[PDB]
Paper text:
2′,3′-cyclic nucleotide 3′-phosphodiesterase (CNPase), one of the proteins predominantly expressed in the myelin sheath, represents 4% of total protein in central nervous system myelin. CNPase contains an N-terminal domain very distantly related to P-loop containing nucleoside triphosphate hydrolases and a C-terminal phosphodiesterase domain.
In CNPase crystallized in concentrated ammonium sulphate, two sulphate molecules are located in the vicinity of the catalytic site. The active-site sulphate mimics the substrate phosphate group and interacts with all 4 conserved residues of the two HxTx motifs and the two central water molecules in the catalytic site through H-bonds, being also in contact with the backbone carbonyl of Pro320 and bulk solvent. The second sulphate stabilizes the long α6-β5 loop. Arg307, between the two sulphate binding sites, adopts a different conformation in the sulphate complex, turning away from the active site. The significance of the α6-β5 loop is not known, but the detection of a sulphate-binding site and the different conformations seen for the loop suggest it could be relevant in CNPase function.
Residue numbers in the entry: 164 to 378
């Protein structure tokens, strides 16, 4: 019977490779004071001065090896769960390997992730009844696809996908900056309100298995 959720779980090698790249990006935001000051300000505003390690702040992360979620099923209880799981494409894809393209890394006051750009084949596994469709209104299907690398202590890692969409909505408008500058792996954008996106000069391909997770 049905899992807590379905998704693509990264292999040991790829999970550590993405983990490290996330870490380094947090350290770059934290090592340069233009960047840290602004993130620290939309995190804590005018709270008592306090030291902040971004890698520590984003220490919380959903259980299990790193993953890109498709459908939350809650063991059959969530809406659309049986209809998702009965699909031949899902049955067929279970236990099989995929490669996920990571196009960007992003951080907000609530979360740290990697944007996934799904192939057309992988989109056949993307559900069509996701919550808040207004949030991705006018964006291609599969826009919120992501791997959550960390989130702040009182944030549900589901927030990560909404944070990504919000960034993609702003960049569809053009309220993206010109890049604040270059980092080793690409152009860095300050979108405002403590939101940062690193657009990778070259996409990272990470290996993963499509399967189900139990709690």
């Amino acid at each position: 019977f049905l899992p807590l959720y379905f998704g693509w779980f990264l292999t040991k090698k790829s999970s550590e490779t993405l983990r490290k790249a996330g870490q380094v990006f947090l350290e770059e935001l934290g090592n340069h004071k233009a960047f840290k000051k602004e993130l620290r300000h939309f995190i804590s505003g005018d709270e008592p001065k306090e030291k902040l390690e971004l890698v520590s702040y984003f220490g919380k992360r959903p259980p299990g090896v790193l993953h890109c979620t498709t459908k939350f099923c809650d063991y059959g209880k969530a809406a659309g769960a049986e209809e998702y799981a009965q699909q031949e494409v899902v049955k067929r894809s279970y236990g099989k390997a995929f490669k996920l393209s990571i196009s960007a890394l992003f951080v907000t006051p609530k979360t740290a992730g990697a944007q996934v750009v799904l192939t057309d084949q992988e989109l056949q596994l993307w559900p069509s009844d996701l919550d808040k469709p207004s949030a991705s209104e006018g964006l291609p299907p599969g826009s919120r696809a992501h791997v959550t690398l960390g989130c702040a202590a009182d944030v549900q890692p589901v927030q990560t996908g909404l944070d990504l969409l919000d960034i993609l909505q702003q960049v569809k408008g053009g309220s993206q900056g010109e890049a604040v500058g270059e980092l080793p792996r690409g152009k860095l954008y300050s979108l405002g309100k403590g939101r940062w996106m690193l657009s990778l000069t070259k996409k990272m391909e990470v290996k993963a298995i499509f399967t189900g997770y139990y709690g």
